[PDB]
Amino acid sequence: KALNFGIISTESQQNLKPQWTPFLQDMEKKLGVKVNAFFAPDYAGIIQGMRFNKVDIAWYGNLSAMEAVDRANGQVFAQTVAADGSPGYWSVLIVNKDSPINNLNDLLAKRKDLTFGNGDPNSTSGFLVPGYYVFAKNNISASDFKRTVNAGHETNALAVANKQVDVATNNTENLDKLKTSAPEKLKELKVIWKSPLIPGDPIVWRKNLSETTKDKIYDFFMNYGKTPEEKAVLERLGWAPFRASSDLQLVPIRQLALFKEMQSVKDNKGLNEQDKLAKTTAIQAQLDDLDRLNNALSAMSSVSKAVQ
Amino acid sequence: KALNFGIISTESQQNLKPQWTPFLQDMEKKLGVKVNAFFAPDYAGIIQGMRFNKVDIAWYGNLSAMEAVDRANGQVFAQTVAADGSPGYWSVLIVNKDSPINNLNDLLAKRKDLTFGNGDPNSTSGFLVPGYYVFAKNNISASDFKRTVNAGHETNALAVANKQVDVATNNTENLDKLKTSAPEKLKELKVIWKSPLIPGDPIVWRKNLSETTKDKIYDFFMNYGKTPEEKAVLERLGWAPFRASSDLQLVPIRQLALFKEMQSVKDNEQDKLAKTTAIQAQLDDLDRLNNALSAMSSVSKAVQ
């Protein structure tokens, strides 16, 4: 039977395939089962594919993993690891190198004359992270810009390269990826803002997979990258071997989704003091649970593993 | 409004109070609301109290907390830490000093001639742990002993010291407690079996407690034991400052309950395989979860 592997629409498929085709082939081989590469116009397409069973395993950014866990039966089992040792990556805003915009203050000031390349609604670095640190903390929305459009990281970055949009979201991984796909364009870009650290991308399966199939998949990801051959496959992906993971790694993305809601609620002029208080306290409760869980994780000295 | 603080029937109230009273008073003080101790004749009493909102915060063992979580609307928020630096505690089997039984091998041999004090069906060390390693692993149950009776840790210990029963379950912390309550009965005991390590006892609240109250209870537990007088109270409880925790600490007890159920299925056509694979599936998840936990380099916390 077929396995469908979902690959989020970070880049065009022409650019995605040389990174992923050797990976997927190596999976076919080790599992002795066909592995179809699954693509979509947006992240939602990979998500809903999982919801309807056409997608078995997937590389997600954290936010779309979260969405896949709450709405598409997904579950995190591995986490990707940067080749160069970074413990994650960062969201950025980019403008053309010629632009007189140099930082967020400049951007905010001139927002009304500027077109904006927003990210994919399900993108962590493209949408949620600047959505909070750039827009919500500053009480502004994308609609305060001259014009606003949602696109993937490569589209947004080419658009800025070609002076087709004034400013856009992106991230530092995508900028290295562009160094391979379009170095004369990357040439043209300038970072004007960089977010806090975002944790590495999870790899996610659908739970309603067989006990046996999960086991095969998981052994493959945990053991991949020993040979010189597979090391190269990973380097091309910018990764080092995989780490074991769980839904726990989504914690801070959940806290961030809530900070933003919190801030949106506080700034909403269309609400009572009373409506606010209902909403904020409901948000506060979830935020406290997550704080206490982070305290528990930090305080763990060992992992009790039961003796059979 | 008063808070109710469940305390499991580890020992008799007479022996618990000098340990717990100074603590619950210090909690009354920090919280500025009355704190009432809640007791029951078995652990089930505490759990069922929580289900019906009669207990707010409890000290439980790992089994009964896991039962409070699945059934009584509970949630772990803190972990007890041994004063002596042990990373947990151990279940044991004890017989009288005078007995010729020295180990499990002897016990199992003479089982039919011996009375057995089993624990409280909700006790990790008194019931689940020997239940697996001693019973299920050897394809026998408490019914293979001459007679079997369920009781708290203290009751079992004194019963073995007073030769009212031949062998019973207990744990290493309860033997330390007994050094205080009845050192002469302690003298009469001998450990003949010791389990794999069990994690420290959790402190659990009911999820529907007000937010404010959770916050103040959390703050108090996290900060306890700075003044000299607070250390003493802890010392008399056999504890060092509390550590932050979460239901995740329940993982190995859930594995253990699953190992056991597995084993009782095996010893019990296609009904077996359907049940064993379903257990194995859950057991696989718990292993992958544990791998995730061990592999966490850092705790990524979102910047407000």
3-state secondary structure A238-307: CEEEEEECCHHHHHHHHHHHHHHHHHHHHHCCCCCHHHHHHHHHHHHHHHHHHHHHHHHHHHCCCCCCCC
**Chain A partners of B302 at a C-beta cutoff of 8 Å?**
196, 251-253, 255-256, 259
- Output the CA–CA distances (angstroms, integers) from residue A144 to A75, A139, A233, A266, in the order listed: 37, 10, 43, 19
Residues for chain B: how many in total?
A: 304
Q: CB–CB of A169/A130 below 8 Å?
A: yes
Strands (DSSP E) contained in chain A are 3-7, 35-38, 57-59, 74-82, 91-96, 115-118, 147-150, 167-171, 189-194, 202-206, 239-244
Residue of A211, A246, A253 lying closest to B289 (CB–CB): A246
Angstrom resolution of this structure: 2.4
- B214 touching A, CB under 8 A? yes
Contact across the interface for A304 and B251, Cβ inside 8 Å? yes
Tell me the chain B residues in contact with residue A292 when contact means C-beta distances shorter than 8 Å.
Answer: 77, 218, 244, 246
Residues of chain A with CATH 1.20.58.90: 247-298
Is B211 in contact with A284 (Cβ distance < 8 A)? yes
| Inter-CA distances, B144 with B107, B134, B135, B140, Å | 11, 12, 10, 6
What is the CATH code of the structural domain delimited by A247-298?
Answer: 1.20.58.90
H or E element in which residue A100 lies: none
Residues of chain A with Cβ-Cβ distance to B294 below 8 Å are: 244, 303
CB atoms < 10 A from the CB of A292, how many? Answer: 21
How was this structure obtained? Answer: X-ray
Contact of A295 with chain B, judged by CB distance below 8 Å, is answered with yes
Helices A62-71/A251-267 angle, 10° precision: 90
Which regions of chain B carry the CATH code 3.40.190.10?
Answer: 1-87+200-246, 88-199
Contact B161, B185 (CB under 8 A): yes
In this structure, are strands A189-194 and A91-96 parallel, antiparallel, or unpaired? antiparallel
What is the spatial distance between Cα A17 and Cα A20, in angstroms, rounded to a whole number? 5
Q: Dihedral sign, CA of A84, A86, A90, A95?
A: negative
CB atoms within 10 A of CB B232: 12
Q: Which amino acid is at A236?
A: R
Contact (CB, 8 A) for B68 and B58: yes
Q: Is A222 helix (H, G, I), strand (E, B) or coil?
A: helix
Architecture of domain B1-87+200-246: 3-Layer(aba) Sandwich (3.40)
CB distance B301–A259 less than 8 Å?
A: no
Distance from CA of B287 to the nearest CA of A (A): 8
Interface of A with B in 11-40 (CB under 8 A): none
Contact present, B16 and B7 (Cβ < 8 Å):
yes
Beta-carbon contacts of A280 under 8 Å, excluding residues fewer than 6 positions away, are A262, A265, A266
**How far is residue A173 from each of residues A10, A81, A109, A201, B171, measured CA to CA in Å?**
10, 12, 28, 11, 53
Please check whether residue B196 touches A, CB under 8 A.
yes
Under 8 Å CB pairs connecting chains A and B tally to 101
Query: CATH fold of B247-294, please?
Result: Methane Monooxygenase Hydroxylase; Chain G, domain 1 (1.20.58)
Cα separation of A93 and A108, whole Å?
Answer: 12
CB A187 within 8 A of CB A169: no
Give the nearest partner residue to A252 out of B218, B280, B302, using CB atoms: B302
Closest residue of chain B to A286, computed from CA coordinates: B211
Tell me if chain B has a CB within 8 Å of the CB of A41: no
Q: Which residue in chain A has the smallest CA separation from B250?
A: A304
SS (H, E, C) chain B: CCEEEEECCCCCHHHHHHHHHHHHHHHHHHHCCCEEEECCCCHHHHHHHHHCCCCCEEECCHHHHHHHHHHCCEEEEEEEEECCCCCCEEEEEEEECCCCCCCHHHHHHHHHHCEEEECCCCCHHHHHHHHHHHHHHHCCCHHHCCEEEECCHHHHHHHHHCCCCCEEEEEHHHHHHHHHHCHHHHCCEEEEEEEEEECCCEEEEECCCCHHHHHHHHHHHHHCCCCHHHHHHHHHHCEEEEEECCHHHHHHHHHHHHHHHHHHHHCCCCHHHHHHHHHHHHHHHHHHHHHHHHHCCCCCCCCC
A208: contact with B, CB 8 A cutoff:
no
Within chain B, all domains assigned CATH 1.20.58.90 are found at: 247-294
Please answer yes or no on whether A255 and B290 come within 8 Å at the CB atom. Answer: no
Rounded Cα distance between A42 and A119, Å, is 10
Q: How far is B91 from chain A (nearest CA, A)?
A: 14
Query: Is the separation of the CB atoms in B83 and B231 below 8 Å?
Result: no
Long-range contacts of A261-264 (CB under 8 A, 24+ apart): A262/A287, A263/A132, A263/A136, A263/A137, A264/A136
| Cross-chain residue pair A300–B293, CB shorter than 8 Å | yes
Q: How far is A52 from A73, CA to CA, in rounded Å?
A: 10
Q: Under DSSP, is residue A215 helix (H, G, I), strand (E, B) or coil? A: helix
Residues 241-280 (B) with a CB less than 8 A from some CB of A: 243-246, 248-249, 251-253, 255-256, 259, 277, 280
**Superfamily name with CATH number, domain A88-199:** Periplasmic binding protein-like II (3.40.190.10)
Using CB atoms, pick whichever of B199, B222, B284 lies closest to residue A304.
Answer: B199
The token duo for A152 is 């993937």
**In A, which residues are within 8 Å of B253 by CB distance?**
306
Residues of A in contact with B266 (CB under 8 A): none
3-state secondary structure of A237: coil
What is the chain B residue with the closest CA to A307? B196
**Number of C-alpha atoms within 13 angstroms, CB side, residue A156?**
29
**Interface test mutation site (partner B, options A90, A247, A250, A292, max chain B beta carbons within 10 A):** A292
CA distance B178 to B185: 8
Neighbours of B143 (CB within 10 A): 9
Work out the burial of residue A64: count CB atoms within 10 Å of its CB; fewer than 13 is exposed, 13-18 middle, 19 or more buried: buried
Q: Which residues fall within 8 angstroms of residue B268, CB to CB, at 6 or more apart?
A: none
Cβ burial, residue A281 (10 Å; 0-12/13-18/19+): exposed
- Contacts of A36-42 with CB under 8 Å at 24 or more apart are A36/A2, A36/A3, A36/A4, A36/A5, A37/A5, A37/A7, A38/A4, A38/A5, A38/A6, A38/A7, A39/A7, A39/A9, A39/A13, A40/A6, A40/A8, A40/A9, A41/A9, A42/A9, A42/A120, A42/A121, A42/A122, A42/A152
Half-sphere exposure of B296 (CA within 13 A, CB side): 25
Taken in order A139, A144, A150, A152, is the CA torsion positive or negative?
Answer: negative
Residues B220, B125 contacting (CB under 8 angstroms): no
Say whether A285 and B211 touch across the interface (CB within 8 A): yes
CB neighbour burial string for B245-282, b if at least 16 within 10 angstroms, e if fewer = bbbbbbbbbbbbbbbbbbbebeeeeeeeeebbeebebb
> Shortest CB distance from A246 goes to which of B245, B292, B297?
B292
To the nearest whole angstrom, how far is the Cα of B282 from the nearest Cα of chain A? 9
Nearest residue on chain A to B213, alpha-carbon basis: A285
